[PDB]
Amino acid sequence: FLTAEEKGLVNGLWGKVNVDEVGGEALGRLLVVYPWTQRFFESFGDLSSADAIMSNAKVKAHGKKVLNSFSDGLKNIDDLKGAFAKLSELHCDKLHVDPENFRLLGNVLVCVLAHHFGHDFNPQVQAAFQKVVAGVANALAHKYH
């Protein structure tokens, strides 16, 4: 699916990501920008404001598990379906998440990557990360039924 040019762009920038910071930021931003998604995360406590979401220990720790799963996907990039198969079943059966939302979150992550990397996140670096986030979302949607 991805060319070695595309992977080198993606993995190269991914190597520079702050693993403790980025996923939490991507998740906090989903919750802030798209406030209907909060209802999925109500055991997480105070989500009453941007500042309250962005400093939530549980959003930060959940964002980190979300980020690690993207890293595993990069680690399994030729087989995203299989990498996300157990997570797909989970999001469907247990979580009742519309897979249309998987694209929302990937695009927030692309926005956080753009935020952290500025000029280095050129249109060609984005496009490759767009291929990743679309593949990720397809694979999470795949075991739905």
Binding site: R29, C111, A114, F121, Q126, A127
Partner: protein, 141 residues
């Protein structure tokens, strides 16, 4: 539906972009054609190669329309009237494509203005770009 904080968020960003509105539009457009190639079907009359002047000239027009939208956030329906006509009656641009541009507008903004691109401003700008998409598509039939 634009709040008071959204409006000052939007005008804040728009002031910081300042004279570079056109370049910001041109870049959002290249990001759009690049990450979302189906958008190019609307511009077969365009040179879409890298560094295109035709794309850059169109970036300014796109910026100018958003500049007018920023001035008239209280009534976007009225201010974007002719543009709604164009994108609906004359060009008929599928709604999904507005989503691709709006997303690349955020990405362009995040790339250029990290100190301004806070979670709340990210939210206010998303609301605005989407307020504008809805108007421009409203006359879908």
């Amino acid at each position: 539906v634009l709040s008071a904080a959204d409006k000052s968020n939007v005008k804040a960003c728009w002031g910081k972009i300042g004279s570079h509105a056109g370049e910001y539009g041109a870049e959002a457009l290249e990001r759009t054609f690049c990450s979302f190639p189906t958008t190019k079907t609307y511009f077969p009359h365009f040179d879409l190669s890298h560094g295109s002047a035709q794309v850059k000239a169109h970036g300014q027009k796109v910026a100018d329309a958003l500049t007018q939208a920023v001035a008239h956030m209280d009534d976007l329906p009225t201010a974007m009237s002719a543009l709604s006509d164009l994108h609906a009656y004359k060009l008929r641009v599928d709604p999904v494509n507005f989503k691709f541009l709006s997303h690349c507008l955020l990405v362009t903004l995040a790339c250029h203005h990290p100190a301004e691109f806070t979670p709340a401003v990210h939210a206010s700008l998303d609301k605005f770009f989407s307020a504008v998409s809805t108007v421009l598509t409203s006359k879908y039939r």
